[PDB]
Structure 1
Amino acid sequence: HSESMQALLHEVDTFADCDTNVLLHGETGVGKERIAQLLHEKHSRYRHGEFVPVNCGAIPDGLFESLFFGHAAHKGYFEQAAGGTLFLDEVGDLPLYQQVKLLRVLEDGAVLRVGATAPVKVDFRLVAASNKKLPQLVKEGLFRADLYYRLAVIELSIPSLEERGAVDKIALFKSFVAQVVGEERLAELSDLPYWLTDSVADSYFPGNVRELRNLAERVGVTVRQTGGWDAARLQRLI
């Protein structure tokens, strides 16, 4: 692993087993959800609940209320994460009105389903994530200050693939390839071609770890279905 990842996983070890809100920073495909699931697993109480991941940028306005608060019948995100961890990715993509609704839930610790007269108490660990500079968005009026100040307590920055370096890239790539082909079969094949791992090291991955895993998956499939390293089919992948 790289120094950056060791420091992050160290921060995770330090701040996981408490009830404080966490804000994750990092590019898309960097592993923010996985880090959130790690915070979930490592919390002595909330581990017994469900992990509920939400992409706040992929929610049409007409469905926000139903998807978050549910219906008197549908169980919304908040109620789904009761006693567990709620993961709000793309939190900056929330419109102001939805930011307010979220804040009220965090403040009041309750949810009113659409059609109900009685609110239901909810308790979840909150992990929010963003690839934007949230303080700039607050200054610009695009993100509510009060919501930010409630969200941005524990802050973790997850480094991109380029920041993690070539050493981490290859170790991830080889790890992924092994999981796809199978380590037993990988042992019966020739060694992983030097030009291939060297290509991975010298490649930039805008889609970060997710993109790298896609490449590894495509490599692995070629390997499994041809019983070796087809230099031609592999070259087409880079």
Structure 2
Amino acid sequence: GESLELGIEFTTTEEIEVPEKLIDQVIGQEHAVEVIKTAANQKRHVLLIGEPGTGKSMLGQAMAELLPTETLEDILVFPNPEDENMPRIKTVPACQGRRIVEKYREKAKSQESVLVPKLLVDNCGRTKAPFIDATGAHAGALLGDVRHDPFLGTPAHERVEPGMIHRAHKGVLFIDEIATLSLKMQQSLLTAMQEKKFPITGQSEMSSGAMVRTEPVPCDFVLVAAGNLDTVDKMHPALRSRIRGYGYEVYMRTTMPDTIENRRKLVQFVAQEVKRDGKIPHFTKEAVEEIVREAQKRAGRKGHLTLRLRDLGGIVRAAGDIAVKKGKKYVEREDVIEAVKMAKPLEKQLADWYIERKKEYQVIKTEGSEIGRVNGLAVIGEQSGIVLPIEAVVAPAASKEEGKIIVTGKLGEIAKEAVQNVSAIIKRYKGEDISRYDIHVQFLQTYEGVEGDAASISVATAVISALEGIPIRQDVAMTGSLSVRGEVLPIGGATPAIEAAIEAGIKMVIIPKSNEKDVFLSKDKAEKIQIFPVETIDEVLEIALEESEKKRELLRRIRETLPLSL
């Protein structure tokens, strides 16, 4: 059998307890959770900065549940006998608003054998402070508006519409992408935050609503603004300064340690997601384990689990949908594996489509050995791996005064400097004669370019192979950065890279020892390939170069130029 320790024994998630309140359902953002609790108690504004689907809105909703619920109010607007264009405002305990209006409305009907106040905000029946999401709202929606009057017309007070700031009175006002609001909206929000009251007035100068401006309307909200890294510098400086000086700024984390306790929380995660969705079956232990395996793969950091839970939640819902279509009673591993494929976001679908097309015209060799030809590995996007064949040949120098290392493949800056670090090793073991050769290296078919330094050890191997005439095993693939002292440095996407080797039929893959905990392979795939974690360039060469006296002499010669420390 193949399983993981989840810190709890269960058959299906139906046995897993789901915390009652939202704040306890938030996983892995301990700091953000502590800020929200303090902000809810001390009534302070918050700015949440992070990637989408990281729980910013969830936190805003959680804060709402932590606010007092026994003094909620209704907001009424009445006609002003003394100044029709300044409708009067009144707040009363929740549920009272409906009664007051109902009462006046009945009298008005009766009398026509009287003016009726309008209920702007009705909080009757609320068991918790309001959560108002004003993300992307327009000026009138956010701050309130007053309809135009074509005519003998309509009383100004009943043309008054509340803004989300008013609906958020004694609750939470959530605004993601806060920096995309106009400067004027951000200034007005700031004013509302300072006064806790904000008059409603018509937004369009061309409307008769423009001359109507009610008494200040209560808007005692706790603001929970959100956005990504660009938001910081684009938002109204005065608004950011206000939150910063009277509240908290939080940067959302994207990973959490892969500990037994944290996995146990992911068990809770699947359960709360199934419960919140209400349209999917419960998950068996194997299915939850697959969810955890996905969390490890999506972390992008060894020893950690992802906190991109909107995405992982998408996989939970898709797995359930698939189970339902198959008429199953519980979601199983097979359903999760199928959900991962079916629920890929647009970005990964494009990356995979691209790599699929490239592989159809790939020139990969996986049997025998070749001089100056090595199978490197590349990762496109987040998870799209592909074998990266690289070739090298040695020629007499075109210039009588110097030897050059000429590399092609549209390399970006990091890749180009990676080749320079490699050349230091080459020049050192080869010696003075190096100035007598031009070494041409070619990353085959990289028409969209080469980025990063993960092909460092590959270039080194191809070049050393070409210089010495020692063939390179084609059944070997490799990836790894390199230091000028010969140390193999870590790379990103070890799993996607290894999966590409496996798909291509490569039997052995070399990776930095630093990345051994970044390898996530099912029992099945693990049996198809031998993984060699390495720390130094000489170890890469002893695995990749074909055996001979020539090779052993080469290794000895190279080891002579590397530090003993290595």
> 1:104-138 deviations in whole A, cap 9, x for unaligned?
32234322231223233312222212222555x1x
Q: State the 4+ residue runs in structure 1 displaced beyond 6 angstroms.
A: none
TM-aligned CA distance change 1:210 to 1:200, over 3 Å: same
User: 1:103 and 2:203 equivalent?
Assistant: no
**Cα distance in 2 for residues equivalent to 1:151 and 1:237:** 41
TM-aligned CA distance change 1:70 to 1:204, over 3 Å: farther
> 1:36-59 deviations in whole A, cap 9, x for unaligned?
12222212267854211111xx34
> 1:187-213 deviations in whole A, cap 9, x for unaligned?
xx6743755542342135999221111
User: 1:118 and 2:118 equivalent?
Assistant: no
TM-aligned CA distance change 1:192 to 1:107, over 3 Å: closer
**Cα distance in 1 for residues equivalent to 2:333 and 2:267:** 21
**Cα distance in 2 for residues equivalent to 1:2 and 1:93:** 27
Bigger Rg, which one: 2
Report if the CA contact (8 A) 1:21-1:125 is conserved.
yes
Q: Which residue of 2 aligns with 1:21?
A: 45
Aligned partner of 2:323 among 219, 223, 232 = 223
User: 1:235 and 2:235 equivalent?
Assistant: no
User: 1:65 and 2:140 equivalent?
Assistant: yes
Aligned partner of 1:155 among 224, 242, 248 = 248
Q: Which residue of 1 aligns with 2:493?
A: none
TM-aligned CA distance change 1:215 to 1:65, over 3 Å: same
| Deviation for aligned residue 1:234 | 4.2
RMSD: 3.4
Report if the CA contact (8 A) 2:174-2:224 is conserved.
yes
**Cα distance in 1 for residues equivalent to 2:311 and 2:299:** 10
What TM-score, normalized by structure 1, do the two folds share?
A: 0.75
Q: Which residue of 2 aligns with 1:208?
A: 308
| Deviation for aligned residue 1:147 | 1.8
Q: Which residue of 2 aligns with 1:146?
A: 238
Q: Which residue of 2 aligns with 1:43?
A: 67
Q: Which amino acid aligns with 2:188?
A: K
**Cα distance in 1 for residues equivalent to 2:331 and 2:172:** 42
TM-aligned CA distance change 1:19 to 1:191, over 3 Å: closer
Q: Which amino acid aligns with 1:150?
A: R
Unaligned runs of 5+ in 1: none
User: 1:82 and 2:169 equivalent?
Assistant: yes
Report if the CA contact (8 A) 1:4-1:159 is conserved.
no
Higher relative contact order (CA 8 A, sep 6+): 1
Q: Which residue of 2 aligns with 1:10?
A: 34
What TM-score, normalized by structure 2, do the two folds share?
A: 0.35
SS state of the match for residue 217, structure 1? Answer: helix
1:161-180 alignment, distance < 5 Å: 162-166=254-258, 168=262, 170-171=266-267, 174-175=270-271, 178-179=274-275
Report if the CA contact (8 A) 1:31-1:158 is conserved.
no
Report if the CA contact (8 A) 1:17-1:44 is conserved.
no
**Structure with the higher fraction of residues in strand conformation:** 2
SS state of the match for residue 117, structure 1? Answer: coil
SS state of the match for residue 240, structure 2? Answer: helix
**Cα distance in 2 for residues equivalent to 1:156 and 1:147:** 12
Unaligned runs of 5+ in 2: 1-24, 73-126, 147-158, 203-208, 301-305, 341-566
> 1:176-232 deviations in whole A, cap 9, x for unaligned?
56535444xx5xx67437555423421359992211111100001222332156766
Report if the CA contact (8 A) 1:66-1:76 is conserved.
yes
**Structure with the higher fraction of residues in helix conformation:** 1
Aligned partner of 1:132 among 229, 253, 256 = 229
Aligned partner of 2:294 among 188, 193, 199 = 199
SS state of the match for residue 201, structure 2? Answer: coil
SS state of the match for residue 339, structure 2? Answer: coil
- Counting matched residue pairs gives 223
SS state of the match for residue 255, structure 2? Answer: helix
| Deviation for aligned residue 1:146 | 1.8
Report if the CA contact (8 A) 1:25-1:155 is conserved.
no
SS state of the match for residue 134, structure 2? Answer: strand
